[PDB]
Design a protein around this ligand. Structure first.
Ligand SMILES: Cc1cc2nc3c(=O)[nH]c(=O)nc-3n(C[C@H](O)[C@H](O)[C@H](O)COP(=O)(O)OP(=O)(O)OC[C@H]3O[C@@H](n4cnc5c(N)ncnc54)[C@H](O)[C@@H]3O)c2cc1C
Ligand SMILES: Cc1cc2nc3c(=O)[nH]c(=O)nc-3n(C[C@H](O)[C@H](O)[C@H](O)COP(=O)(O)OP(=O)(O)OC[C@H]3O[C@@H](n4cnc5c(N)ncnc54)[C@H](O)[C@@H]3O)c2cc1C
Ligand SMILES: Cc1cc2nc3c(=O)[nH]c(=O)nc-3n(C[C@H](O)[C@H](O)[C@H](O)COP(=O)(O)OP(=O)(O)OC[C@H]3O[C@@H](n4cnc5c(N)ncnc54)[C@H](O)[C@@H]3O)c2cc1C
Ligand SMILES: CCCOc1nn(C(=O)NS(=O)(=O)c2ccccc2C(=O)OC)c(=O)n1C
Ligand SMILES: CCCOc1nn(C(=O)NS(=O)(=O)c2ccccc2C(=O)OC)c(=O)n1C
Ligand SMILES: Cc1ncc(Cn2c(C)c(CCOP(=O)(O)OP(=O)(O)O)sc2=O)c(N)n1
Ligand SMILES: Cc1ncc(Cn2c(C)c(CCOP(=O)(O)OP(=O)(O)O)sc2=O)c(N)n1
Ligand SMILES: [K+]
Ligand SMILES: [K+]
Ligand SMILES: [Mg+2]
Ligand SMILES: [Mg+2]
Lengths: 598, 598, 218
């Protein structure tokens, strides 16, 4: 019994116990902001050399920083905030983390247990509020159960589909001293079923019949280091073209001939065409989000027909049962970690040297469906697509890893389309919730996770405006991030929809921008401004060559649609393609309708 | 039956119906930010001349702006945002509004009803999330019930204790067209009980026995235009000294001899002394918050004794039954609007010409307990207390109303203490939740509510850093707000607690500031910087004389405590007072302990 | 009362504090509160599409449930449809009585303990007309193996599942509907039936049906 109890924490405050448990969980970075309720914990971590503390300007900043840290490192991102407004300010990042499967462990101070439920000073019901945007939350009620709750939080956050958890820490608990022994298992952090094994064999048999297979890969494949390796091994062995979600970008080397690029609403029309014509869809760590499937009832016709005929269908490798058969019926559901299950799957799959007819179609679709757009003309502004390509081409010249974060909007889609993705965890973007303001703090967090990487925030001007105060935080953290603001002086993605569906009635979608160069100067950040085509190359080089935080502003063409586009309600292969004459007519119509204002 | 049904909305979209209902509710200002889910409503309000639309940089900005608008105008503040991150970004303002009793009506876009519950693109469970930080919320499920839900929202927000409500608007509902007639009562917006009348008579009898009465007045008295008038009438008739909460500032003219100033943790020791010695406490629209009562079991000893002896006690005029007998037992509870009940109360109260002994004590306590502090010395930095006085004195010179907003921290308390408050709805500050970042957007909203007022944001540097992007919003809205940043390069209120309780261990409470003058310039805002004593007067004058948005930065003394102070756990009259020698010793100790760093 | 009786009917609870029910009304109230209380383009198109699908069917079956009972004309229209297009009818446990079981077209109850003839017929039908039924797990059997012939028909554009359902929550909850017809099933049948082609005989289908009934008594 003495062997099962631990007394080594006796005499410590809850705060000191928190500090010790952080260490035992190999936490090397904490993002947070002080306040009254969380003071006992802040006193305990005072001048700690055991981890780096990152101080934002706003707790939303801390949340998104921790998300960026988590996406870049594969470790849980740890947040430490005070009660009340400190806690409610992390709600958007928690909801963000939930939608995108990001392991976020949020510790929020709380008013003393004697004051809870009295509408106390700086008291929020954060457990109630955050219940719908966490995998799990808890309020620690005494110091003896604090190690257990910390263990549970980290475990739940990082297993299954990763996600945010919140642990509420009353001030009197974290100030109290442990007087009793606790189970030694709480002071320490932490086979394939017959059913799954049979499903795997059945799925392999199905794939071995396929004549038009396609791999549809997502974020799940990134949650294991061997993930991308096994994905490639499968695609090579069975000779299968690979498409990814926005969140799967980097899982497959896009320079590979088998790469179909990104699928979905703004993905490649070649990818969208191929998945609509495939007889076998291998879904690896992807959840069939509504940005990807198009009109659900019209999605994957050829795979549905194949399943009914016993010669194909959908093979879904998914770790979370909630997401199995949620949107589309899986022909075979393979539950568990996709990477681990691929190890069992692949040796049952027949090696295939050639698929002449399938790959003839694939290669034809790729040739006819590039990411085309209207090029610059003499005197015109820089096109946003051209800027992205310029940044992508120059960024590879360096002998360093390149990590990209984005805001939300057109710039995000163009970044997705026009970068060439080759490495896992290099696309760090808000996809499920789609939070503007994400780009800058996510970049700081990723840069902290990866001090030797080039970290680039491709940001819209409206998105960037939302959290631009965190520039100071990059300087204070020593994070030499590279922010590129595409200045089109509009909420481009909304105006695209207003041009398309509301007859060019731009309702409150043009916000005023600060002078970004003077803003950078005020934040002690290097500033670069590119205003014309002739400055593009040299401007981007100065940007990438910088060894300090740097803000690049680029003046880009306004009222330019992201294409291709699958409009809401349309089948995944019923897309709009770029056309020069159509664009010209669209400009004329916009000009007349707005009286030349746009 | 034809007389009871209305068909006048038939043929309109939900968005157009929303627009019409705004008008019928006399909404003249909407604060919001666009996005996909709320596009049908934005299309409907496109180029509306029926109200002013205010566009922030961040939806939290919209929320706090609407709060400031609501506090300044007495009208509900209306917020219009999109789904997902648009909605979760308003959570802190809603929680803020709930704690401070602010009528906030939040309209959030939602994904189409066909997509709800599928983890859809930009879908948040905002009804679930916001349940604990709203009086009430609802999701509109068809267009026919949209007028009814809007009516209910405005009614609930503005009656009882005012508070935030949220109305969730699915995109397909707001895009759908009304095809059927609806009850005409839903297309149009909207005696004292025997029990209360008897309680009033009993309370009057109790007051007529009192020898040491005191009025404890709060935000409730401000929720009626006749409120301050009746408060004064009562105090004059029965010869009663008046103290207010932070949220009650302006309810009573502080230049009146009867004024005891603010009570509580950082209120006047004279006020705190008087309430601890009063035999009759008349609580008018105040909720006995824990910042005000001190140690609850030791609060109001003389009033408790008087009640037990049938010659005094606590008379609580409260509109919300939840807040009656929540913290302290009321001797008599008078339910309902305090102003309306005062009309019945006052004529039952005996007129009193003099209370020689009580007012002798009062006047002695006022003389011995001023808001004393260490004055400037030659070459020293400006003291934050002196700056507030300078701003207060000069601001009265103008023939205009003066409205003050604040951030949260020491500057907030010094603003409360050292301004002279004389008019209702001139103190607009976050008290219950205590949200940093509140000051700037609240000022913009108040300035929009009151275009002819001088609106001053007394802000801390850390608070201001949290939402400083909204400077651009002030320019774009044409709101000539006056922001004064007290730059002490610290989170002063937290460092005060760290000096006091954690032996000068300043754990992560010193954030780096931008260059505020270059920041202002980048935002197209006038900038003034005061760095020494000799510039104080002329700097503040330039600040107040400006006719454009203006940012004043003042370099102020660091590591200065707010005094008086009732430490947590101490009786309301067991306070710390300012002492010159103590301050000097405290400085020496801080200097040695930090090795001269502080 | 309104919420309880509209949409899919269900329970509601109203909590009545004693002081409220003892208190006396002192103020006037909106007169609309003292008194109790068209087909969308989208649904109308779905109905036409569903009728086209049924007119192609060679092995149709009606799967009828409690919803058809929530209108007095329900059973009448169910019979009118089955008679016009010559369609065998099976019901859930909760649909019993919706169709006269003495009728030759009756397949009796389907499901875990239903007629093996009914269960056989629904597994072999190319068109399933679901009328006010929610595909409960007592009825579908193994979901992934349910209605193979209807799934194949949908993929081939010659059949599928036509779901007449009043509650959107229950549409595409368990099985994908080829066409979803939202609203009251009885009201929608009035629009549906005249678009359906009259059929006098289905010799091969009903030969199978009658054989299954003979070999699968209780
Ligand atoms: C403006 C905008 C436009 C967008 N347009 C597109 C678009 O055109 N194309 C596109 O693809 N996206 C687009 N999105 C993003 C989209 O909304 C989703 O965020 C994204 O598609 C989801 O990708 P995912 O399924 O791979 O990742 P996730 O949403 O994270 O889902 C991963 C799935 O894998 C599972 N999983 C996790 N770990 C494991 C494991 N170890 N083993 C097995 N399974 C696991 C998860 O449970 C989950 O089911 C857009 C976003 C925005 C803001
Ligand atoms: C750093 C900091 C320090 C603070 N220190 C202090 C301090 O020293 N002193 C201090 O006073 N505050 C202080 N506070 C603020 C404090 O937390 C509360 O916000 C404030 O005291 C509440 O004042 P109130 O009761 O008047 O207003 P409210 O919290 O709004 O309560 C008003 C009450 O009146 C009721 N009411 C509303 N309308 C009516 C009506 N028409 N008729 C009748 N009743 C009505 C309400 O239901 C409620 O019960 C501090 C805040 C911060 C951030
Ligand atoms: C021991 C036991 C064994 C059972 N075994 C069987 C079995 O073998 N076979 C069997 O059938 N059942 C069986 N059940 C019952 C089964 O669990 C379900 O209760 C039943 O099958 C549901 O039938 P239903 O879908 O018709 O009715 P409901 O569950 O009431 O569903 C009716 C559907 O129609 C919709 N609807 C309602 N009104 C309308 C309207 N006006 N217009 C359009 N749609 C409407 C509803 O929203 C709902 O989706 C068994 C129960 C028990 C206790
Ligand atoms: C109004 C002054 C603001 O400064 C502070 N007040 N304060 C505290 O008041 N700390 S506290 O344990 O005794 C407390 C008691 C009752 C209700 C709430 C709290 C609380 O945790 O507030 C954060 C606290 O810890 N700080 C820093
Ligand atoms: C990924 C592109 C982002 O741009 C937009 N997408 N979008 C929409 O997709 N609008 S939508 O009605 O058909 C929709 C359908 C399913 C799930 C969610 C939504 C939604 O409301 O998203 C906001 C929409 O309205 N906009 C502006
Ligand atoms: C916090 C928040 N508010 C609103 C939205 C809605 N929204 C808005 C307003 C977009 C326009 C973004 O503008 P941008 O300048 O950042 O980028 P682009 O001009 O390249 O589109 S995109 C989008 O989904 C959002 N995603 N997040
Ligand atoms: C959003 C948020 N985070 C944290 C806190 C906790 N907190 C903090 C960090 C304060 C210091 C404020 O610093 P300041 O510079 O704005 O003002 P002073 O220096 O005058 O105190 S005051 C306070 O309550 C808070 N109130 N709100
Ligand atoms: K690419
Ligand atoms: K004062
Ligand atoms: Mg833009
Ligand atoms: Mg400060």
């Amino acid at each position: 019994k003495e062997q099962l109890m631990d007394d080594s924490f006796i005499g410590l405050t809850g705060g000191e116990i928190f500090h010790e448990m952080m260490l035992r969980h190999k936490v090397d970075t904490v993002f947070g902001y002080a306040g009254g309720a969380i003071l006992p914990v802040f006193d305990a971590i005072y001048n700690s050399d055991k981890f780096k503390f990152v101080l934002p300007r706003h707790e939303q900043g801390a949340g998104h920083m921790a998300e960026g840290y988590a996406r870049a490192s594969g470790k849980p991102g740890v947040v430490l905030v005070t009660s009340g407004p400190g806690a409610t300010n992390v709600i958007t990042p928690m909801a963000d983390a939930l939608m995108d499967g990001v392991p976020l462990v949020v510790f929020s101070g709380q008013v003393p247990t004697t004051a809870i439920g009295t509408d106390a000073f700086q008291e929020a019901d954060i457990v109630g509020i955050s219940r719908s945007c966490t995998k799990w939350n808890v309020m620690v009620k005494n110091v003896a159960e604090l190690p257990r709750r910390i263990n549970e939080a980290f475990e739940i956050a990082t297993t299954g589909r990763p996600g945010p958890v919140l642990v509420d820490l009353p001030k009197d608990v974290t100030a109290s001293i442990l007087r009793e022994s606790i189970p030694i298992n709480t002071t320490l952090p932490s086979a394939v079923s017959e059913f799954t094994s049979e499903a795997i064999k059945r799925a392999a048999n199905i794939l071995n019949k396929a004549k038009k297979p396609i791999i549809y890969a997502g974020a799940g494949i990134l949650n294991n280091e061997q993930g991308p390796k096994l994905l490639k091994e499968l695609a090579d062995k069975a000779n299968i073209p690979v498409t990814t979600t926005l969140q799967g970008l980097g899982a497959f080397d896009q320079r590979d001939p088998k790469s179909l690029d990104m699928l979905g609403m703004h993905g490649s029309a070649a990818a969208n065409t191929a998945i609509q014509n495939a007889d076998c869809i291998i879904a690896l760590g992807a959840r069939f989000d509504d940005r990807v499937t198009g009109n659900i009832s019209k999605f994957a016709p050829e795979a549905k027909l194949a399943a009914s005929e016993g010669r194909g269908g959908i093979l879904h490798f998914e770790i979370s049962p909630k997401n199995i058969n949620k949107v589309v019926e899986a022909t075979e559901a393979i539950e568990g970690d996709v990477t681990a299950n691929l190890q069992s799957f692949i040796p049952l799959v027949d090696s295939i040297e050639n698929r002449p007819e399938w790959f003839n179609k694939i290669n034809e679709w790729k040739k006819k469906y590039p990411y085309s757009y209207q090029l610059e003309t003499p005197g015109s502004l820089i096109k946003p697509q051209t800027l992205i390509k310029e940044i992508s081409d120059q960024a590879q010249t360096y002998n360093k890893e390149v990590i990209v974060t984005t805001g939300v909007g057109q710039h995000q889609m163009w970044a997705a389309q026009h970068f060439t993705w080759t490495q896992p965890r290099t696309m760090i973007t808000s996809g499920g919730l789609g939070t503007m303001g994400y780009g800058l703090p996510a970049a700081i967090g990723a840069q902290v996770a990866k001090p030797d990487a080039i970290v680039i925030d491709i940001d819209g001007d409206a998105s960037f405006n939302m959290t631009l105060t965190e520039l100071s935080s990059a300087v204070q953290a020593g994070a030499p991030i590279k922010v590129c603001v595409l200045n089109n002086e509009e909420q481009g993605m909304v105006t695209q929809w207003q041009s398309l569906f509301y007859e060019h009635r731009y309702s409150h979608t043009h916000q005023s921008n600060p002078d970004f160069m003077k803003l950078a100067e005020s934040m002690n950040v290097k500033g670069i401004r590119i205003t014309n085509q002739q400055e593009l190359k040299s401007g981007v080089k100065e940007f990438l060559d910088a060894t300090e935080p740097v803000l690049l502003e680029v003046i880009v063409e306004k009222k330019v649609p992201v294409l291709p586009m699958v409009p809401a309600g349309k089948a995944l292969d019923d897309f709009i393609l770029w056309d020069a004459e159509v664009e010209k007519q669209q400009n004329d119509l916009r000009k007349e309708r707005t009286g030349g204002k746009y």
